[PDB]
């Protein structure tokens, strides 16, 4: 699929799982579904900062259905970025360890 162009709304509070990963549930507000969800993490200065996706491939099947995303964020302070463009969801996260 092509990358989603639309906006995302956070559906639930971001949650830490038992094993140092985060569960992010988002709701899509676009017209181009199905599409792949832009998902990344940055540091404070906007630098791309490494990690891995537990969720296979984040895809919006139905814009009325929220999508779950499990990820292993970098350690310490980062920003989880869902979507792209001016309306990109930018969420602060701290991972202890």
């Amino acid at each position, epitope marked *: 699929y*092509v*990358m989603c162009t639309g906006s995302f709304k956070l559906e639930k509070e971001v949650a830490e799982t038992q094993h140092g990963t985060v569960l992010v549930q988002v709701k899509y507000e676009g017209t181009d579904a199905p599409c792949k969800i*832009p*998902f*990344s*993490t*940055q540091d*404070e*200065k*906007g*630098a*791309t900062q*490494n*990690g*891995r*996706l537990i969720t296979a*491939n984040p895809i919006v099947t139905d814009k009325e259905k929220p999508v779950n995303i499990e*990820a292993e964020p970098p350690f310490g302070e980062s920003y989880i*970025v869902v979507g*792209a*463009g*001016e309306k*990109a969801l930018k969420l602060s996260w701290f991972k202890k360890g």
Partner: antibody
Amino acid sequence: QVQLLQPGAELVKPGASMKLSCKASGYTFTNWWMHWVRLRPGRGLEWIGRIDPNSDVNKYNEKFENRASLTVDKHSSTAYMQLSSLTSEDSAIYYCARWFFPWYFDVWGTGTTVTVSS
Amino acid sequence: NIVLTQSPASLAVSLGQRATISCRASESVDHYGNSFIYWYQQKPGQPPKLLIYLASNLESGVPARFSGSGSETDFTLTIDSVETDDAATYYCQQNNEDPYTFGGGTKLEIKG
């Protein structure tokens, strides 16, 4: 329609300092990061740094860090890039570019042809 | 720094024929399953213009003849049928890690 306007040319002496302007229009200036990139003849494109005009957070290419300064003026929606201790190696076309977060550069400035000469 | 090497330095393609430009990275530009790499087009007297993002996605307004592919360290830009206005220099760029780096540029000419 988005426009990033820069002066066409600057002529500065070696060792001197320069301050380049990028005047944004057509959008909410503080909603997008601004990057700076230069093009040298036969040497390609080089990334200088980025700044968030909203919060003044920034990051430099280490090659330019001791020598460069990124600033904005929210009031006039203008971003500035200052580079000092200029040599002939800094003669280039300097572009400011808007960040399509967190990926590519969607809008490029008009460009400022900079000549470092005695 | 991630080094991006483009090939060839320049090339000429007969009008209507296929063109291919490659970009090779000194290490991975993948971030959460996406390639943080971009292709820009620049013509003389003009600032660059984005064509392809995340290796394979077409920017709106860009003709369908443009396509890109690859992952990790090997990427290609393809124009399956060149036209006159496709003559330009093409640059790949990564932002998978600071500082952002650009490829050396590939200059495409058109015959006919």
